[PDB]
């Protein structure tokens, strides 16, 4: 779920702002190749104070 450069290592700025370039290597790319990235962030198990995991365990 990340976006790096390929020439240098500089982590490119988010495509949302404008076109894609590394601040050091200044390589340019097609912004629409990698647009619409999918991010599905979940929460680890056994982190909420339960009421029912008693009967659910």
């Amino acid at each position: 779920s990340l976006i790096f450069c390929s020439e240098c290592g500089n982590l490119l700025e988010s495509t949302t702002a404008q076109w894609t370039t590394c601040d050091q290597c200044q390589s340019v790319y097609p912004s629409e190749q990698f647009a619409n990235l999918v991010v599905e962030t979940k929460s680890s198990a056994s982190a909420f104070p339960s009421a029912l995991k008693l009967k659910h365990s």
Binding site: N36, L37, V38, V39, E40, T41, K42, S43, A45, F48, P49, S50, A51, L52, K55
Partner: protein, 79 residues
């Protein structure tokens, strides 16, 4: 009676919105959050707070508190 006794017990006790909720996935892009909730049967098992209660109170106060604490992280990122 004993049934009404346990009813008052579950009443005066406070449920915390965490104790009802399952895993909370947040799909990103915009910004999108989804909260799982268990079936009404187990819901009234532990409880006896009604669905419309969830709806109204959840929406309003959950909204407000989420707003405030995300403003907190924003203001800390400002620092």
């Amino acid at each position: 009676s004993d049934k009404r006794a346990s009813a008052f017990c579950k009443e005066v006790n406070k449920l915390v919105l965490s104790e009802v909720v399952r895993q909370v996935r947040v799909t990103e892009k915009t910004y999108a959050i989804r909260l799982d909730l268990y079936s009404r049967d187990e819901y009234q098992d532990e409880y006896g707070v009604l669905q419309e209660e969830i709806e109204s109170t959840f929406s309003n106060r959950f909204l407000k508190i989420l707003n405030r604490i995300i403003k907190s992280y924003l203001a800390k990122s400002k620092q």
